[PDB]
Design a protein around this ligand. Structure first.
Ligand code: HEM
Ligand code: HEM
Ligand code: HEM
Ligand code: HEM
Lengths: 283, 146, 146
């Protein structure tokens, strides 16, 4: 979330960018294609050689769009509306790639703005490009529809008194599948059957039950949990995706009749929204 | 790919029960439903507008079976996934232009489908071994990308 | 880790111009500023209240230099990063409990720091070579996690 001082820092740097934004945009794509060659799969129709008119034009278009976003930083979803539609329905770039371009744009700005690229401005620019990325990927699936909310309530209703037991199973599945997540629990017994893991699973399932109950008001209902994870526990955001998968696996294994493709899709969306809320105060 | 005896045993035992036709189409269909941007590679497959259209789309079912068929063969050569998938790796990069991140999403959907189909028999240690394998296969398919 | 001779030379040439102490301190400070959740390991380092407090903290600077000194010595072992970093991998997992995701964040912040330090000299091909090296170093530090 862009603080007012964040907005000040971005406007500062981007002004300095000034008339070179298009050149810088092209350089960032060229850096991306070279450092992260999987990104070239989205441009097989381009001459991707150095200095190519197609790559230059791409950079200027992308630069103009970021200029638009800087100039409308307090209403980005609306300023970028057309662009969110096009990437969501037509281009369909996998979201992970936005992080790769954002890193190469940061690198480009660093290499060109020696005086301005201070630690605080770097932090602000990083947050700004993550917000842009978030807005551009926001319609790929589009936040919770009334059908999504119905599906979630129906499935979570069937979980019911088993909520805690499925939360403990989800953690155990996560620890065995993705051993790096164990680094957050060095003080627990992680063996199968562990009461500490059972207790953790219960707390998490209980919070989720609270989220389904307040599905139209999740940021307030989880505000204290958002604070806890961001300033105390400080779990790296990538791990929320790993637990969400393991929760989905757990539900599938216990709910053979209810876990339809449509319900699977709505649950994945719901857990991603929960994850978003829990990491929203990190920076 | 190195698996422990315990892990390789779990993988092979469960795989003998898998109907490659049914599971394969299920996994590709759910990928297209849950992550709809993956539909960008299948424009010529017909109607994929609703979960029901997707799941019952026969071209989806046919392609799904083919994909899982090639995965199945890879289970035979767990010691050399790279060499086994080299030609398909080059294919997916040079001709099909598929972002390797899709292989990871497909792997995770497959694990979801296995849990759904097998229930309590798909235990935590069994999932863990399958997660290793799908990660191995995805890295193998991404190996020849340039 | 496999780099071409060209890339190796590109990495080595630039590194000869680096002041390990200054760059090391700057990269750790920027990591703690830009991704503040990474501060979770350094509550004994004292004042981390603001970007300026972070960047001028002597304990931050000292740890930064230590980290980059180990990085630096790894650059002389690009063909055996895993064996070179094996014991440090076990240390960060069993005793320090550091999520390997932090190593990737650290690697990206170091690349920004080099670009800031060296400007136009930090060309796209030179960047590409460092991106492989910090990825390779991160994988090697994560190798012994269990
Ligand atoms: C900050 C992130 C991004 C912004 C602001 C952005 C913006 C744009 C804009 C303004 C256009 C042109 C729209 C038009 O002319 O109708 C475009 C096109 C495109 N973008 Fe994005 N983009 C971003 C990230 C990405 C990423 C990460 C990729 C892929 C790795 C990507 C791939 C494409 C493709 C394939 C095109 C079409 C090029 C053509 O064939 O003309 N974009 N983008
Ligand atoms: C759906 C995602 C999550 C939710 C809703 C959630 C919720 C919670 C809840 C309810 C607590 C207990 C707070 C209290 O003591 O009152 C908690 C604590 C904790 N969470 Fe999260 N959590 C989530 C994801 C994660 C992830 C992915 C990790 C790390 C892999 C994690 C690690 C922790 C840790 C380390 C604790 C404290 C354990 C203890 O000392 O008792 N959380 N979480
Ligand atoms: C473990 C995962 C996968 C394996 C082993 C696999 C295997 C294959 C095989 C054996 C073919 C046939 C090539 C030929 O007929 O010459 C193929 C084609 C194809 N694959 Fe992959 N695939 C996998 C994942 C994916 C994913 C995730 C996508 C995209 C979301 C994808 C998209 C395609 C496309 C578009 C074709 C061509 C179909 C056509 O002819 O219309 N593949 N794949
Ligand atoms: C490529 C990156 C890194 C390398 C090469 C590296 C290397 C080292 C070295 C050489 C030590 C000293 C071990 C000893 O006492 O013998 C160390 C300790 C430590 N590192 Fe890492 N490290 C890296 C990244 C990180 C990151 C990103 C974090 C956490 C955000 C971290 C946290 C720590 C901590 C907390 C210690 C212990 C310091 C103390 O006890 O005073 N390391 N690291």
């Amino acid at each position: 979330m862009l603080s007012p001082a964040d907005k000040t820092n971005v406007k500062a740097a981007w002004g300095k960018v000034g008339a070179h934004a298009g050149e810088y945009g092209a350089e960032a794509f060229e850096r991306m294609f070279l450092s992260f060659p999987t990104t070239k799969t989205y441009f097989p129709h381009f001459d991707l050689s150095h200095g190519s008119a197609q790559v230059k034009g791409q950079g200027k278009k992308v630069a103009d769009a970021l200029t638009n976003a800087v100039a409308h930083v307090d209403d980005m979803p609306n300023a970028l509306s057309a662009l969110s539609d096009l990437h969501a329905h037509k281009l369909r770039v996998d979201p992970v790639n936005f992080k790769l371009l954002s890193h190469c744009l940061l690198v480009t700005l660093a290499a060109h703005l020696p005086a301005e690229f201070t630690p605080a401005v770097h932090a602000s620019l990083d947050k700004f490009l993550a917000s842009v990325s978030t807005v551009l990927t926001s319609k790929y699936r589009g936040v919770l529809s009334p059908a999504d909310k119905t599906n979630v309530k129906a499935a979570w209703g069937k979980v019911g008194a088993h909520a805690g037991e499925y939360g403990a199973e989800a953690f155990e599945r996560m620890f065995l599948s993705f051993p790096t997540t164990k680094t957050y629990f060095p003080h627990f017994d992680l063996s199968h059957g562990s009461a500490q893991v059972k207790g953790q699973g219960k707390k998490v399932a209980d919070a989720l039950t609270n989220a389904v109950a307040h599905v139209d008001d999740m940021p307030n209902a989880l505000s204290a949990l958002s604070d806890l994870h961001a300033h105390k526990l400080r779990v790296d955001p990538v791990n929320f995706k790993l637990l969400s998968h393991c929760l989905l696996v757990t539900l599938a294994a216990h709910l053979p009749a209810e876990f339809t493709p449509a319900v699977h899709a709505s649950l994945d969306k719901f857990l991603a929204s929960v994850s978003t809320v829990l990491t929203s105060k990190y920076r | 790919m190195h698996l422990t005896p315990e892990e390789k045993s779990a993988v092979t035992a469960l795989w003998g029960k898998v109907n490659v036709d049914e599971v394969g189409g299920e996994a590709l269909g759910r990928l297209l439903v849950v992550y709809p941007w993956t539909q960008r590679f299948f424009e010529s497959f017909g109607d994929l507008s609703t979960p029901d259209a997707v799941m019952g789309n026969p071209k989806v079912k046919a392609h799904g079976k083919k994909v899982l068929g090639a995965f199945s063969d890879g289970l035979a050569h767990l010691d050399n996934l790279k060499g086994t998938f080299a030609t398909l790796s080059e294919l997916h990069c040079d001709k099909l232009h598929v972002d390797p991140e899709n292989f990871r999403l497909w792997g995770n959907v497959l694990v979801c489908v296995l849990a759904h189909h097998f229930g309590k028999e798909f235990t935590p240690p069994v999932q863990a071994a399958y997660q290793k394998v799908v990660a191995g296969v995805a890295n193998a398919l991404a190996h020849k990308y340039h």
